[PDB]
Q: What sequence folds into this?
């Protein structure tokens, strides 16, 4: 799995591949791993099971609702519950969330990670290949966030056997 | 075990073999791995223990009763319970459910999987062999869902040591 | 890797994918795994390292030369040396060889092996997926051996994470 | 794999199935597990790798050449080498050898086993099922060695997932 | 343990050995593993602890009472409670029950199971040895069900280290 | 640990050693592993922790009280609870109980074991050495139950590194 | 396996059971584990493979020959070679040797063990059960060495699942 | 991670690196692991997730408030809640807190701990490298606490693969 | 470790980081992992021990010498020996070699890998991060091979905890 | 095993227990583990097999002969041969040797070692218990070396399950 | 164990502690881990078995004799033998060697490591603590090589449980 997000010139993009694997075989090649949340104002990408994703995206929306739409505050609150609720502790996954203000990785191990100054985030088994390609592109070209995400996902798809080249890409605004 | 499902021309078929292997021997040879649930409106097949499967089938029917018979919603709700409940987490198996609208694989690891455009799903140790044969037949012949399921189960049976030639094939007219 | 061979209507075809993997990552995606030997009269596919393949193919040619083009006798002697010499025993590659008369699989651990009446052979991690698709196509369509190999390689490349869709296909017309 | 040997009324028969399983799939289905050695005066069957077996069969014939064709002496000498040689210790398998006087199982763990008064020997994952059926038939019917071997192999085949219905049966008239 | 049942010429027999093992040692050699239930009309054999058996047999009787002697319905309900209750789920015993109409195996993990056309059933570590001997005897002799069970138990007791030769055999004449 | 019981000429004795070990060292060498229960009418020996013993002896007394002092009935009831209560399932141990009528071993794995006709029972790591010596003495001498228990515990103490020679022996009446 | 030796009133006996096991099943039930060596002047019992036994008994005879028939000296020399020869180090087993002067256990771990004052030795998985019974008999009866060996082997056979009751007993003189 | 604190000549300093790792890769290199609490009067460093840290620091502030700035009492109560609540017990972070009076380490497993006479404290995988460098510098130079923390963090960052050289250093002048 | 090679506009470059690690700590941070061979006409990078590197670079030079300086031929010959020589088989590592004609990865598992059409190769734990960045740069910028190698090594150094930023870069010509 | 030596007031004593264990059972309880060498002038204790000890002691004598009774030089040469010869390297015994001048421990892995100012040495699994008791007795009582060794062996025999209380004690008056 | 080497102002010092730990206890406390080799012109220290170390030291001196006393060449040659020789591969340890020109670490895993510009090397479980302290002292004081080594060994000793305060420090004037 590869999910990568880039923010450039007032645009933020989150994109992912479509491969769901079981052991060394492919169960599905067109999964949609990126969704729009909170009245389409938040982009969310997940590396993990769909049902697991629904439970966590559901709660994150409840956090946004009670926390005035503050991404960081909502993210920290989600992480706290995910880290301590006996039910949620069974959900193994990683998430990337982004809104018009900032981008974050949320984990189930009590961490919420902000990006470096280049504003790029990536998760999944192939995430670091997209991250490497994205940083190269951001630091050496004028390409748009959308174009970098597309090119980075492709590079990750050609290296990671668990990442394919069937992408789902969401942009905001 | 091999369970395969094909949907074509308004017909939905789910079938499986009959071999139950204990250790590396044939425990039973005429198991019934596909069943009709929800007043005969749902087909369900399982790869795993018979007792475990019956437990999950009953729970799924309760989810269907709860969510107006909507398959995807019910499957996601079952996957969530399966993922967190102490007793259900001890239940090892994979499920295929199908009604007149859609087909899904349900897992105990937080995944609910929809088929690709071919509308085929397969599970079990021999699942991928039936999947390969079914995809070849759907894309290259005019055979019916029933015929493809029978022919795919037979091909899987000649390759997988744990898959039988004694099939139970159920269809939703 | 997936290498598959089909013989139909006087045509024999051997084709393979192009992925070379190290762990769960791809080192090369355009590998040619099928070669023409014995001045074009023999098609040879291999799952394994290129150095191993070069060694085994050069040794195989030598044998074909001294057995005046007899594939089976040449293969039987190859397998004999393979299990005899401590140097060759270190080679883990798997091979498929085919001429206008017959098709065979040769490995260092299982000596020589012939196909069933359908004359399909497959090796590599994705082999059985290709085999399942090929058997379905031979038994249910009038497709040529080339068409079947191309379609079976594709089906396997869509299921096996170690097999890709960049194929090299050779045919003995 | 199932190899079984029965001696009755001056006839000595050794037979086996034809299934070679790679992982948990049918690698090959028509293997020849029983062979005639020593100018056709010895029958030998093996449970394990084909290459490994051929290596041990060749070594056994050299032992027979060395010890005037005496089966027990040669088997003990083979067992000793198999037990200590660096390369042979890597060879995993069990063997059954039989001539017109006696039958023996040879192992790589320092054992040479003679049959009980029933004069029956069996090896392989399905060996004990064939052993049970053969003992029942020798003690309760007047069937010949050949018939008992065929019927015992078939019974083992319905129980052991790794045993085939394609037999090679050799007899010493 | 080895429990085996054969039905022939209007006679049904269930018999078992008497060894109770803890690790690789024998705690008891004269255990009675076959009992007469439902006032003598039902033969029941079990592989497992005596406390577990007492629990399951008392529960089975209750069901036979409310199902007016119907073995299958009683067994199906037994298996339902077995997988339903957390208390019963802890019971790992395996059972064989037989009346003048039919013979069945019941386990906590595989629910209820019926025999093949030969009407032989077996459970316990030595079960398959008894099954192999019994199938050979049914298919090749005119022996009574009692004779076959006695001879099959003996063959299994001579192969399985956890089965002995002190048998308890019950017959429904 | 070694606990052994012999019943001879109207006398029943239960005795045990005094060693409590942790890993390969001795924590205590004078533990009292045999106690008198039910108004001194029942002898009880335990292989396991003291607190574990107290919990189980406590419950067994409650069983005797509600089951009219019937040892077998009380033992089966204790085993059922021990086998299924989530709390009791954590207690790992074995027990021997004896009254003026009979002797029994109670386990936490759903079994209650009665002695062979020689009326000797033994548990603990050294139990089978005392059992061997006891059977030799019972079958070949006229020694009293008390003397055999004492001599058997001593023999076990000289063989098992986890059994010592500091005994606690209770007799009834 | 159980081999036990007792020396009483000028007679020394070595006896063993006949079971050869592979995993949890019996390969042979009438093996002869005790032999007479050195012109019938030495008794030898072995727990291990037959071929392994032949190699070691062969060398021990060579030691006797060059060491004037001195058992202890010959035993220590055999142990030294067994402990250090790369070939012999592969032989896993234990031996008991006895002559008219003394009895010894020889191991492959650089040890030669003399008996306690009771002059009883035992090896094999069931050896300590025969040892316990033998010591009880020697210390409490007037039975002959032969009778004690026979009764001890029987007691071990009823406890150890890897020891049977088919004995081979040799006496000297 | 490496967090280290040194107190010298009325100055207390706490500093840490900025690497956040997941497995053997870096998720972030500019993390701020040292924060100013209690309106600037308390320096706090942490090894662990940011969500965990936010939780523990908010809880610590609350305690400082009710203990009127008493670091030790506040830390002791923090550690009490940490091991008491099942929610907090899931938090694995390690903390270092320091005010103008004293410096302490607090963890969920080891409660509160104070420094040795040199007043150096360190946590994180690289902690002991920083501690070793700091002890050498305190005992052999006149360097300020700030200089020592900066130099010790650098030495640790050059040895530990999970610690980098992007430091955040806070001082209480 | 990260070694990466790019060939662009008649220039070929091989560069690597300087970190040598033992477990999770750094043994050396300025290792030179790229050398010039064959009279400075060949560039060689290695991921593995220095002594191991010297042995293999030494042999590769011997191959060049006897094979007229043909890189591919020399590489295949080195791989064959490395794959089969008992001494060389102990050397675990990966190598990249380049001359004015082509670039290759040589492994000890019988493989020699040529680059894709972009002519980029990379090995080491961080190799795929440099590979991702290099491909992004080659496909989207006009930067020189030297500049891409430098920027790619840097990106890999910021992600892989086992790769640092102390580079050694060689260019040809 | 426990061997301990104490030197006090011109007396040196070496004593050991008598237990020989195989796994968790006792093969012999009256072993003599301390011997007088060099015509009575050297006391030698050993933890290990008797064959190993015979080998090492005969080799040690030879060295004492050529070093005219010099214990240290003889021991240093012994240790040299021990780690030099592939035959001797297989010997795992541990030794303690003492003469009227000094006491030393010699092992195949740690060469020669001398005692601390208290002149106590101990080897064997129970060694450190004897050492702890001996150090307490030397530092706090006026007891003779013989009394201390006897009392320390007893304390160790009461704690270590592999050490018994049948001691052999030798003293150089 | 902690061995550390520092070179400064023409002085080269190698030192180590004296603790040898067997299991988790202090086997010996005054080991001599640093030795002078090659006619006193080379200093060598080891982390690992004493016997193993002495074997490697002897072999190194032979390499020095072979290569005109050149340290690096000799170290690389030793590393090559250590890497491939069957017996030497069983030798677990790390070495530090130093002469008047250079210092190196030699490993059995194909590595020969030179120090960074600080000219410091350290090995052993406590090596990195001594390394940290030595680097702090070399970069921030004017202490001599000898003083830094002693002070670094002491700091390591307060942190590593396996490192002593009894040092052997050798220097090359
Ligand atoms: K991919
Ligand atoms: K099958
Ligand atoms: K693929
Ligand atoms: K089968
Ligand atoms: K048995
Ligand atoms: K004991
Ligand atoms: K037995
Ligand atoms: K670092
Ligand atoms: K790094
Ligand atoms: K003891
Ligand atoms: K220490």
A:
């Amino acid at each position: 799995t590869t999910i990568v997000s880039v923010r450039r010139n007032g645009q933020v993009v989150v994109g992912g591949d479509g491969q769901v694997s079981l052991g060394n075989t492919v169960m599905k090649g067109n999964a949609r791993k990126v969704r729009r949340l909170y009245n389409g104002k938040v982009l969310a990408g997940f590396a993990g099971g769909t049902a697991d994703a629904f439970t966590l995206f559901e709660l994150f929306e409840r956090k946004l609702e009670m926390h005035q739409g503050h991404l960081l505050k909502s993210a920290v609150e989600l992480a706290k519950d995910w880290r301590t609720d006996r039910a949620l502790r069974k959900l193994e996954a990683m998430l990337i969330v982004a809104d018009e203000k900032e981008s974050l990785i949320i984990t189930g191990i009590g961490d919420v990670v902000q990006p470096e100054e280049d504003q790029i985030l990536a998760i999944g088994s192939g995430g670091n290949y997209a991250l490497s390609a994205a940083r190269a592109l951001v630091e050496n070209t004028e390409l748009s966030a959308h174009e970098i995400v597309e090119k980075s996902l492709r590079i990750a798809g050609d290296i990671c056997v668990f990442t394919n080249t069937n992408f789902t890409i969401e942009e905001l605004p």
Summary: Residues 71 and 108 of chain H are 17 Å apart (CA to CA).
